[PDB]
Amino acid sequence: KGFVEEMRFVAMRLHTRDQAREGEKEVKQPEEKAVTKWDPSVEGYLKFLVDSKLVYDTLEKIVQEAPHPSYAEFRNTGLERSASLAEDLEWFKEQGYTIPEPSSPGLTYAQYLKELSVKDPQAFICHFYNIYFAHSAGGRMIGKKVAEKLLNNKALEFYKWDDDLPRLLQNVRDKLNKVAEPWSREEKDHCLEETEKSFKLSGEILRLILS
Ligand code: HEM
């Protein structure tokens, strides 16, 4: 039975019920409240977008270099976001905003991903799944609400895909199921146990929006 379903179960229970129907956590950090209650700023959102771009650039470099050969299965999935973020940062530059340097949440996550990618493929796969699949789920609703609050409803490229998203996602889920099928139970469990750290490091990047 498909291992992605196991990763999704763990991810959902780590959401707050404010923010997702299947979430089981209480609101503890900002950002963990329902998005409609957020008070974002453009300054904070730009830090979030720059730090996000650093993480996506890092994930793209890891699957191209493929220090473990299974990572090459995840090249060119259609979910890559670095080009879309570059376009959106240029839109903000054309509007007169300053683009910030990467902040500590993105620098920290990028460094950790590079380390994991070499030493711990099971833990890396947990982050690959949670980072990309978070974005195409709640990330889209964050983008829409932030654009309503601050951008007069501008629809940024970060929230657009060149192909049907349900099919893109399902084909990556089936690739993830295939890379995990030879794993032992212990390797699968090790992957699942990494999910809290992905939520922590991602959450610190999301919190920039509200900073
Ligand atoms: C402000 C924060 C967040 C909100 C509002 C949010 C909201 C949601 C919602 C409403 C869903 C269910 C809809 C769906 O499956 O398409 C979902 C799914 C998901 N979220 Fe989040 N989420 C947040 C943060 C995170 C974080 C930090 C992670 C992990 C780093 C994450 C990982 C996932 C995953 C993996 C799914 C399953 C998506 C799928 O099955 O394709 N989310 N999220």
Residue numbers in the entry: 16 to 226
Provide excerpts from the study.
In this study, we have determined the high-resolution crystal structure of GmHO-1 complexed with heme at a resolution of 1.06 Å, which is the highest resolution for an HO structure reported to date. We therefore adopted the iron single-wavelength anomalous dispersion (Fe-SAD) method for phase determination and successfully solved the structure with refinement finally up to a resolution of 1.06 Å using SHELXL and COOT. The GmHO-1 structure comprises four 310 helices (residues 45–47, 50–52, 84–89, and 172–174) and eight α-helices designated as α1 (20–29), α2 (57–80), α3 (96–110), α4 (119–134), α5-1 (136–151), α5-2 (153–166), α6 (180–196), and α7 (200–224). The heme molecule bound to GmHO-1 is sandwiched between proximal (α1) and distal (α5) helices with axial ligation from His30 residue, consistent with previous data from electron paramagnetic resonance measurements. New features of the GmHO-1 structure include the shorter α1 helix and an additional irregularly structured region continuing from α1, which has not been observed in any other HO structures. To accommodate this novel irregularly structured region near the heme-binding site, the α7 helix (corresponding to α9 in HmuO or α8 in hHO-1) has become a curvilinear helix. Because the C-terminal α7 helix is curved and becomes a curvilinear helix, the last half of this helix forms an unexpected tunnel, together with the novel irregularly structured region. Although the plant-type HO lacks the conserved Asp and Arg residues for the hydrogen-bonding network observed in hHO-1 and HmuO, it has an alternative hydrogen-bonding network formed by Ala149 and His150. On the proximal side, the imidazole ring of the ligating His30 residue, which is rotated approximately 160°, and the δ-nitrogen form a new hydrogen bond to the carbonyl oxygen of Ala26, whereas the δ-nitrogen of the other HOs forms a hydrogen bond with the side chain of a Glu residue (Glu24 in HmuO and Glu29 in rHO-1 and hHO-1), supporting the plant-type–specific accommodation of heme near the N terminus. Interestingly, the back and side walls of the heme pocket are negatively charged in GmHO-1, whereas the other HOs have positively charged walls.
